[PDB]
Design a protein around this ligand. Sequence first.
Ligand code: A1AB9
Ligand code: A1AB9
Ligand code: CL
Ligand code: CL
Ligand code: CL
Ligand code: CL
Lengths: 4, 4, 124, 124
Amino acid sequence: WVIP
Amino acid sequence: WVIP
Amino acid sequence: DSCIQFTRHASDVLLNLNRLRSRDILTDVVIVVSREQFRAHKTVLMACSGLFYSIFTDQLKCNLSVINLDPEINPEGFCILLDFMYTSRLNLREGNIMAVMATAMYLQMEHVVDTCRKFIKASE
Amino acid sequence: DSCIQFTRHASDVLLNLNRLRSRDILTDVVIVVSREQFRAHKTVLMACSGLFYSIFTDQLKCNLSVINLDPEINPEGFCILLDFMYTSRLNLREGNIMAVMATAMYLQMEHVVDTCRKFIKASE
Ligand SMILES: N#Cc1c(Cl)ncnc1Nc1ccc2c(c1)CC(=O)N2
Ligand SMILES: N#Cc1c(Cl)ncnc1Nc1ccc2c(c1)CC(=O)N2
Ligand SMILES: [Cl-]
Ligand SMILES: [Cl-]
Ligand SMILES: [Cl-]
Ligand SMILES: [Cl-]
């Protein structure tokens, strides 16, 4: 999971 | 396009 | 093999599947979550959820145009997860995390359940 | 928005769509290319090809279960492109490049046409  |  | 790969292809396919959903093009099922209805493509639902994969590989249920979810399922939690299925983006907030996690557990979406557990553990 | 994103989601969706295609699950059209037939999902074809997007948004053609391609279309070229649609991987070879490019032009798959033009220009 990432900060897009 | 890339070499996968 | 000696194939070349187009990095953005999968993302572009999903963007187009979401555009088709927004315009209600070739949607083949309506998911009913208490008073709310959500139109979708069975193949995308199966590709994202262990529960839908089981439902639509069933010889009788594969032919249904309406699927009714358990009455304990929260429509907003379902909406957030349906958006995630079509975009890879999860709108996870303090006010919805419990509903999102409970819905992801029911839908059998392990990666969502995992990030919800991690975000909850960080706040305790 | 304040969304989080699952990097592998789009790739995992496409992998599952390909698994459904391989098992002939919820495929809703057969593409006929001279003596050959290819089963697929209309939504994936539309999401990858300008030609299929046009065909399946047509009020009459959207309901067809069989689509016959132009007799000049090479089945192997079509097979390579159908595999690309479901995997992001293009099996581009000296022996098939002309057929692949001609099929990608007909199917309106601009990124494939682009890499074919580049590979051809490099060999001249
Ligand atoms: N459509 C399809 C499909 C196929 Cl073909 N093969 C394998 N899994 C499929 N989908 C599916 C099954 C289980 C789970 C998910 C997706 C996400 C998750 O957390 N559990
Ligand atoms: N399905 C869908 C779709 C939608 Cl909804 N919106 C916009 N394009 C869509 N698909 C589509 C249209 C034109 C082309 C491609 C795909 C690849 C290419 O080279 N040309
Ligand atoms: Cl029904
Ligand atoms: Cl997931
Ligand atoms: Cl027909
Ligand atoms: Cl393309």
